[PDB]
Design a protein around this ligand. Structure first.
Ligand SMILES: *[C@@H]1O[C@H](CO)[C@@H](O[C@@H]2O[C@H](CO)[C@@H](O)[C@H](O)[C@H]2NC(C)=O)[C@H](O)[C@H]1NC(C)=O
Ligand SMILES: *[C@@H]1O[C@H](CO)[C@@H](O[C@@H]2O[C@H](CO)[C@@H](O)[C@H](O)[C@H]2NC(C)=O)[C@H](O)[C@H]1NC(C)=O
Ligand SMILES: *[C@@H]1O[C@H](CO)[C@@H](O[C@@H]2O[C@H](CO)[C@@H](O)[C@H](O)[C@H]2NC(C)=O)[C@H](O)[C@H]1NC(C)=O
Ligand SMILES: CC(=O)N[C@@H]1[C@@H](O)[C@H](O)[C@@H](CO)O[C@H]1O
Ligand SMILES: CC(=O)N[C@@H]1[C@@H](O)[C@H](O)[C@@H](CO)O[C@H]1O
Ligand SMILES: CC(=O)N[C@@H]1[C@@H](O)[C@H](O)[C@@H](CO)O[C@H]1O
Ligand SMILES: CC(=O)N[C@@H]1[C@@H](O)[C@H](O)[C@@H](CO)O[C@H]1O
Ligand SMILES: CC(=O)N[C@@H]1[C@@H](O)[C@H](O)[C@@H](CO)O[C@H]1O
Ligand SMILES: CC(=O)N[C@@H]1[C@@H](O)[C@H](O)[C@@H](CO)O[C@H]1O
Ligand SMILES: *[C@@H]1O[C@H](CO)[C@@H](O)[C@H](O)[C@H]1NC(C)=O
Ligand SMILES: *[C@@H]1O[C@H](CO)[C@@H](O)[C@H](O)[C@H]1NC(C)=O
Ligand SMILES: *[C@@H]1O[C@H](CO)[C@@H](O)[C@H](O)[C@H]1NC(C)=O
Ligand SMILES: *[C@@H]1O[C@H](CO)[C@@H](O)[C@H](O)[C@H]1NC(C)=O
Ligand SMILES: *[C@@H]1O[C@H](CO)[C@@H](O)[C@H](O)[C@H]1NC(C)=O
Ligand SMILES: *[C@@H]1O[C@H](CO)[C@@H](O)[C@H](O)[C@H]1NC(C)=O
Ligand SMILES: *[C@@H]1O[C@H](CO)[C@@H](O)[C@H](O)[C@H]1NC(C)=O
Lengths: 428, 330, 273, 98, 49, 49
């Protein structure tokens, strides 16, 4: 691993940081609220009497299992353009509340039912918010919206005094003030009704054909979920590193009994990373704390690769009464789980060191380790040795009231000093 | 660690980040260089003596009271009372001591390695330096340590600044009392002042705030749908999860590069300060400096080093003139 | 009547539904600014044993939500009306409470004003008031309804000292009416006491209407303690009924170690804040 | 460019230019920091050549370990080497001092 | 100033800049750290008396 | 902003913000290095005085 982290078949004496160890998860768990009833969609789509666009019919969907895999045959689905969640990955999520706003509009306006759009229908009839998350579904309806004479049934709004805020209905049987005369229902000269109809026939061409469009808007946010996908929840496991899929929130870690004070309107915990720390069990209503799996960095202490091929592995800041001392298959990210883990395990204030043995004797140290501990390569028959570094040769002075030490000789020593003065000049 | 900080335990994000090349091996190498530089700084400043000297068991230095700067064997840490006050006055954020609440909120590859030299052997370097400078003068800064009575050493430190030996040998009681009073009141002034170790506290707090801000960067969407990558991989298909994860990669990697560059500049400044401290220890302590206003204010006499969390404190004993008189001169 | 008072530090609620502890998380949302006018309003319908029409209850503007606070014995204040002009031209919302129910709905009320003033509406002698609704008289184009648990959980301390302060907050952000509420019976008689309190949400529901209008509903068949005078323009008058106006502000909230909100700082107040 | 069309080729090339420009920014910043460090070292070397070589330095432990006597400069690829000839005491005797 | 240099009097730009987090709040701190240091630079050089 | 709808303006504004901020970060980085260059000279001047 050391030879692989830096491109070389020879590694010089020292300590090298190679990678990190982290306990891998054992088995995955999914926990959704136990819902058996199904929210029907047949009456949502298979109905020939949908409302117009200035008053679109909004259906709130409630506690159910949203298996959106059998609806694709209830309409042609000319366009299934969806924002937020990708269309395919909907069956594996849980939503707070979902609203189906259905209506029928003119074809040229189908692209106008979108976040942040402007025009006749996105300013005066039905405005979609800029941060809209949800799906939009549109298709044709010419099979029945056709008469030999006319279909005087559908309506929309032309003139409004001001643009309406997103998600607002504006039903109003009022007469617009055209011109200056404030007519009170004359509806004659300079007073026209603010709504026009949708008489339709098969004779009319493409683009003006009625497009039936339903938008499904979901508030995928932190709240007790109401509608969920078709996943069979499994049993809960605690104090053991697993993958959890808590009510649509996926992650890895250990779940422990938590003593927090989740208020009834709260469902998720949070720390300062915008990552979930605590979560309540959806079908138990118990507060359990999520702690990420044990991990740390590994440093490889090597003597000269020409001297020996044995190494000493240091786990930084880890108390290895944990899984390092009792390691098993498929539990650690490093595949080299071949240590006996029974001998030459020394605990260091920088994390325990395995592969080297501590001794009481102290020397000046070659390979630094940390926290006053160092490593070297020593004889008895040869091994990597760990010890507290020796600061210097302890000695004493002979201080006294009337004692002075005077040298009688000298030496002219020629030491050396090396100082960089400049580096290479580079242009690009 | 890029592998865990930028991407949280996700194979897809790590694979996508692998395309960016050496934008993460460079960061690890730079941080390792910074750590090695800080390991070398303490050795440069303190490890100036080949051996370690111990004071004689008897403590009489001609009336000079050094009990406030020598280690106290009764204390568990074997530190000087002034060193203990310095340790108490400066509070460290993290030290990386077998951790296995804000520091606990760093399950993001942000690990504070512990220093090579514990503050038990740094105290030993300080004690050796101070014992050498009280029991051998500056002679141990050149070659072998040569014993000399402290009154003689102080007389020659006077002779260094242009006042003859007789001044000390005729006012020794007065100089001893003044030095003892100054050493006694420096502790009181240091403790009573609301913040005297401002520089070391700023050094600690700057790193603490840098790590805090780096942690808080994970809560930033960076123009993505969400600031947590386990949601994007569970909310979007791989074709668009690619783009969103890449945007998060760019944002978090830019924040990490900014952090590393700021750490490099801060480490350069700290290295300059440590080189100044090493020069000050070599000249003020292991000798007498004739440079004006280098070792304190006034004609410098001597200096005593003391350890402190991520720093050093020099006690500069200096000779300051006093009440003067006019005279007619030719 | 009508009078003015100082809001002090009241009307802060939980913005989001996540749990936090020992954090200084800051939000930007519609809030009630610290130290602002709160205007009392009193309904005065009693005079001896005679009707004595009062023509009370003027129209209160509703902009960016409204904050409410009253100290009623049992059910003096019932609900609220939201909409525009209450006419058969624009649809409007109706909130009214019950014994244990709430029947808030959206309709096109042509008229719903029949308080049924009583010839013996004096509370000292008797309080005979059962099902005095006389509401939903007409409905031109009305199909939306909603029924759930009542917002106010009136709790009695068997004495008048522990008066409830039923702080409510109403918002109209993209539909989704938020009805944050908390009961704080720590009141002792002083209006808007010095201190700090939070508000938890009750119900969230989208309809979509503008609502440049706001009033209140009272059980006028049983009312008392309604002093009347000509106090106006920064004066005093007993109402036991508060109204405050919310603006989009930025708040710095200090979550407690337990998880509650201990303090907040308004980022649009004095420069120190 | 050969495999793709400009409508997406310009976007992908812009991404690649952004990446390469960021890499060059990092290289330039690292070079600037290294140049600051080398300039500090060169200032120290100039001071040592001015004091240790062009004179005798009374500063202790500056121009070599021990009492400084004299110095010699030598050139080296991208640097200088100082040969500090210094005076260091030797075998000593105790003495009663007054 | 990020609120003028990056986004020039554009509310829909300032709101989008917040998605980058407390990114150039460091820039204000970094430049203030230099500016505060400059006043200390000219003071330690001259105020020696 | 006047030639694009909010949908595709946000992705286009982000392009400008991530560039101006990057060009603003470079200015701060240059100043920080330049501040150390001046501080080294300021320290020398204080020592020289
Ligand atoms: C002369 O100096 C030497 C050291 O340079 C002294 O040697 C040590 O002195 C201490 C102080 O009493 C003793 O505890 C050690 O046992 C001495 N070492 C040895 C090897 O004997 C010495 O005492 C000094 N005085 C004389 C008369 O030699
Ligand atoms: C000081 O030390 C020097 C070390 O060289 C001594 O010189 C040596 O003296 C011995 C005895 O005469 C000779 O055998 C060696 O050949 C000399 N060395 C050299 C390099 O010439 C010198 O004698 C010592 N002085 C005193 C006073 O002890
Ligand atoms: C000066 O030295 C003397 C002894 O040499 C110290 O005297 C004792 O110090 C301890 C430590 O605080 C006190 O508990 C004793 O009460 C002191 N005894 C006497 C008789 O004074 C003295 O503390 C030293 N001066 C300072 C400032 O520490
Ligand atoms: C003061 C007065 O005259 N009050 C009258 C009362 O006499 C009468 O019986 C009642 C019903 O008409 O109306 C009221
Ligand atoms: C809608 C509703 O529940 N109304 C109730 C009614 O059923 C009950 O008889 C009455 C008695 O308090 O209170 C009110
Ligand atoms: C003084 C008084 O109480 N007068 C009457 C009382 O006679 C009557 O019984 C009651 C009705 O309950 O109304 C009142
Ligand atoms: C959509 C709807 O409900 N329309 C009805 C209408 O058919 C009826 O004639 C009228 C009578 O007031 O009430 C309304
Ligand atoms: C949905 C809604 O409430 N719309 C009304 C509108 O009908 C009315 O014209 C306007 C002011 O007159 O206030 C608003
Ligand atoms: C409920 C309250 O006001 N304060 C509680 C206190 O009673 C409790 O002892 C403590 C232990 O977690 O938590 C807090
Ligand atoms: C879910 O399981 C719990 C466990 O007993 C049960 O009480 C609850 O009724 C179940 N949910 C439903 C909808 O039945
Ligand atoms: C609804 O389903 C029935 C099947 O019973 C079918 O006859 C009818 O045509 C469907 N309606 C529409 C609008 O597709
Ligand atoms: C390692 O030691 C052997 C001695 O047997 C020597 O021949 C070889 O050159 C050395 N290699 C290195 C890289 O030091
Ligand atoms: C670390 O492990 C040692 C081994 O005995 C134990 O005594 C100590 O309490 C542990 N500390 C922590 C913080 O786990
Ligand atoms: C090391 O020292 C301890 C006590 O200081 C002693 O008990 C032990 O036997 C020594 N040798 C070892 C641990 O090999
Ligand atoms: C120095 O003199 C003092 C006089 O009180 C005496 O106590 C002390 O023991 C003397 N030192 C030595 C080393 O004899
Ligand atoms: C409340 O309004 C009155 C006048 O209407 C004014 O005098 C007073 O200053 C206002 N209070 C506050 C806190 O602004």
């Amino acid at each position: 691993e050391t030879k692989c982290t830096l491109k070389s078949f020879t590694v010089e004496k020292g300590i090298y940081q190679t990678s990190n160890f982290r306990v891998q998860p054992t088995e995955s768990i999914v926990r959704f609220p136990n819902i058996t009833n199904l929210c029907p969609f047949h009456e949502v789509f298979n109905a020939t009497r949908f409302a117009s666009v200035y008053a679109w019919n909004r259906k709130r969907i409630s506690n159910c299992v949203a298996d959106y895999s059998v609806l694709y045959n209830f309409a042609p689905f000319f366009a299934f353009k969806c924002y937020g969640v990708s269309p395919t990955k909907l069956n594996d999520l849980c939503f707070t509340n979902v609203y189906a706003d259905s209506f029928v509009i003119r074809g040229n306006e189908v692209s106008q039912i979108a976040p942040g759009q402007t025009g006749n229908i996105a300013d005066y009839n039905y405005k979609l918010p800029d941060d809209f998350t949800g799906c939009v579904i549109a298709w044709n309806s010419n099979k029945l919206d056709s008469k030999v004479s006319g279909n005087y049934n559908y309506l929309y709004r032309l003139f409004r005094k001001s643009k309406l805020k997103p998600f607002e209905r504006d039903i109003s049987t009022e007469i617009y003030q055209a011109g200056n005369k404030p007519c009170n229902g004359v509806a004659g000269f300079n007073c026209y009704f603010p709504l026009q109809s949708y008489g339709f026939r098969p004779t009319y061409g493409v683009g003006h054909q009625p497009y039936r469009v339903v938008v499904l808007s979901f508030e995928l946010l932190h709240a007790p979920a109401t509608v969920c996908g078709p996943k069979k929840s499994t049993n809960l496991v605690k104090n053991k590193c697993v993958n959890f899929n808590f009510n649509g929130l996926t992650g890895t870690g250990v779940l422990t009994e938590s003593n927090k004070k989740f208020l009834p309107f709260q469902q998720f915990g949070r720390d300062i990373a915008d990552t979930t720390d605590a979560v309540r069990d959806p079908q138990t209503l118990e507060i359990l704390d999520i702690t990420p799996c044990s991990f740390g960095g590994v440093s490889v202490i090597t003597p000269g690769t020409n001297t020996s091929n044995q190494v000493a592995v240091l786990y930084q800041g880890v108390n290895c009464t944990e899984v390092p001392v009792a390691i098993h298959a498929d539990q650690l990210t490093p595949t080299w789980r071949v240590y006996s883990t029974g001998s030459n395990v020394f605990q260091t204030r920088a994390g325990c060191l395995i592969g080297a043995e501590y001794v009481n004797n102290s020397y000046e140290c070659d390979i630094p380790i940390g926290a006053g501990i160092c490593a070297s390569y020593q004889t008895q028959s040869q091994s990597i040795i760990a010890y507290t570094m020796s600061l210097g040769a302890e000695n004493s002075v002979a201080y006294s009231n009337n004692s002075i030490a005077i040298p009688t000789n000298f030496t002219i020593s020629v030491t050396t000093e090396i100082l960089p003065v400049s580096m290479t000049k580079t242009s690009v | 660690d890029c592998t865990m900080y930028i991407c949280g335990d996700s194979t897809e994000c790590s694979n996508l980040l692998l395309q960016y090349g050496s934008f993460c091996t460079q960061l690890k190498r730079a941080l390792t260089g910074i750590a090695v530089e800080q390991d070398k700084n303490t050795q440069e400043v303190f490890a100036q003596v080949k051996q370690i000297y111990k004071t004689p068991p008897i403590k009489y230095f001609g009336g000079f009271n050094f009990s406030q700067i020598l280690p106290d064997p009764s204390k568990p840490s074997k530190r000087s009372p002034i060193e203990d006050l310095l340790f108490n006055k400066v509070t460290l954020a993290d030290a990386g001591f077998i951790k296995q609440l804000i520091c606990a909120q760093k399950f993001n590859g942000l690990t504070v390695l512990p220093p090579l030299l514990t503050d038990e052997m740094i105290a030993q370097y300080t004690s050796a330096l101070l014992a050498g400078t009280i029991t051998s003068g500056w002679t141990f800064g050149a070659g072998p340590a040569l014993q000399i009575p402290f009154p003689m050493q102080m007389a020659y430190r006077f002779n260094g600044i242009g006042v003859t030996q007789n001044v000390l040998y005729e006012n020794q009681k007065l100089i001893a009392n003044q030095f003892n009073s100054a050493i006694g009141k420096i502790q009181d002034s240091l403790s009573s002042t609301p913040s005297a170790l401002g520089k070391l506290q700023d050094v600690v707090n700057h790193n603490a705030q840098a790590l805090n801000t780096l942690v808080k960067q994970l809560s930033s969407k960076f123009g993505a749908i969400s600031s947590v990558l386990n949601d994007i991989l569970s909310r979007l298909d791989p074709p668009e999860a690619e783009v969103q994860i890449d945007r998060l990669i760019t944002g978090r990697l830019q924040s990490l590069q900014t952090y590393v560059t700021q750490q490099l500049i801060r480490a350069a400044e700290i290295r300059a300060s440590a080189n100044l401290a090493a020069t000050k220890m070599s000249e003020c302590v292991l000798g007498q400096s004739k440079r004006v206003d280098f070792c304190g204010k006034g004609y410098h006499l001597m200096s005593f080093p003391q350890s402190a969390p991520h720093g050093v404190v020099f006690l500069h004993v200096t000779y300051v003139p006093a009440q003067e008189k006019n005279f007619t001169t030719a | 009547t009508q009078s003015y008072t100082n809001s002090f530090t009241r009307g802060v609620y939980y913005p989001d539904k996540v749990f936090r502890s020992s954090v200084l998380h800051s939000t930007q949302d519609l809030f009630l600014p610290f130290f602002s006018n709160v205007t009392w309003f009193h309904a005065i319908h009693v005079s001896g044993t005679n009707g004595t029409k009062r023509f009370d209850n003027p129209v209160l503007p509703f902009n960016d939500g409204v904050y409410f606070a009253s100290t009623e014995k049992s059910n003096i204040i019932r609900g609220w009306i939201f909409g525009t002009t209450l006419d058969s031209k624009t649809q409007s919302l109706l909130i009214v409470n019950n014994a244990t129910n709430v029947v808030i709905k959206v309709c096109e009320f042509q008229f719903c004003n029949d308080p049924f003033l009583d010839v013996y509406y004096h509370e000292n002698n008797k309080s005979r008031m059962e099902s005095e609704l006389r509401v939903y008289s007409s409905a031109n184009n009305c199909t939306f309804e909603y029924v759930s648990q009542p917002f106010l959980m009136d709790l009695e301390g068997k004495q008048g000292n522990f008066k409830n302060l039923r702080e409510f907050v109403f918002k109209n952000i993209d539909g989704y009416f938020k009805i944050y509420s908390k009961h704080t019976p720590v009141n002792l008689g002083r209006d808007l006491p010095q201190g700090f309190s939070a508000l938890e949400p009750l119900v969230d529901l989208p309809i979509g209407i503008n609502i440049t209008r706001f009033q209140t509903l009272l059980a006028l068949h049983r009312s008392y303690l309604t002093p009347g005078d000509s106090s106006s323009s920064w004066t005093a008058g007993a109402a036991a009924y508060y109204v405050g106006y919310l603006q989009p502000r930025t708040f710095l909230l200090k979550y407690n170690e337990n998880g509650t909100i201990t303090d907040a700082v308004d980022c649009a107040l004095d420069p120190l804040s």
